[PDB]
Amino acid sequence: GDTKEQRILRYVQQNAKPGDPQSVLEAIDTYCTQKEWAMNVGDAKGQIMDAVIREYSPSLVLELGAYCGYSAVRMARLLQPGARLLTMEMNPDYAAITQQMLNFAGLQDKVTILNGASQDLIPQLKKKYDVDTLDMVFLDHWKDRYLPDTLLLEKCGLLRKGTVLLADNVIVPGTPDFLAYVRGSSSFECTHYSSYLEYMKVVDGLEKAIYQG
Ligand SMILES: [K+]
């Protein structure tokens, strides 16, 4: 335990109930808040993520970007039996911590972690990972990857009419390249979400882009 992601997991093991996803989600939040890393992700990012999942009930979700596994736990706990979450992460440390988090949550059954580059794995999804089309895409942590990844998922025919793309940390004026694309193009129907919590400043911003075929 030297890295931040290692400390998050250390804090989870020492405080969260093993096999209880909510206890885990709460432990990550409590720790990230006291150490002033992420203010209140559980109600900022979390509630938006939950609402999107309950609204669309996706059978196949692809997460592009992972750090400590919060998003993976938050998403997996709401999936239906038969539903699966494919998480792609380039960093082997972030990919490892995420696996351990899911393992601790008792959700590894519902998640498949793919350690490698999005640019290389996305074109392999159809044959190598038995994927026809994605019902949902979750874009996380790496803002400069949102646009090329979206463009790639389109090139690869992984999106269909109704595919939901949910991008995190899409806060004004950051990540404008991706925004100009989805908002601009008649191929996406967009909804922005700005979580303020009890404060007057955007704690978290999220873009929901529904593909129209
Ligand atoms: K649009």
Numbering used by the authors: 45 to 257
The authors write:
Methylation catalysed by catechol-O-methyltransferase (COMT) is the main pathway of catechol neurotransmitter deactivation in the prefrontal cortex. COMT is a single-domain Mg2+-dependent methyltransferase that catalyses the transfer of an activated methyl group from S-adenosylmethionine (SAM) to its catechol substrate. The crystal structure of COMT comprises a central β-sheet flanked by α-helices, constructing a bipartite active site that accommodates the methyl donor SAM (in the so-called adenine site) and that can also complex an Mg2+ ion to which the catechol substrates bind. Here, a set of apo, semi-holo, holo and Michaelis form crystal structures are described that define the conformational space available to COMT and that include likely intermediates along the catalytic pathway.
We have determined such structures for rat COMT in a variety of conditions and crystal forms. Water replaces Mg2+ and is contacted by Asp184 and Asp212. The β5/α9 loop has now swung out to its maximum extent. In the open state neither the adenine site nor the Mg2+ site are formed. Residues His185, Trp186 and Arg189 stack on top of each other, with Trp186 occupying the usual position of the adenine base. In the absence of a ribose, Glu133 hydrogen-bonds to the indole N atom of Trp186. The different sequences, crystallization conditions and crystal settings all indicate that this form is a recurring state of apo COMT.
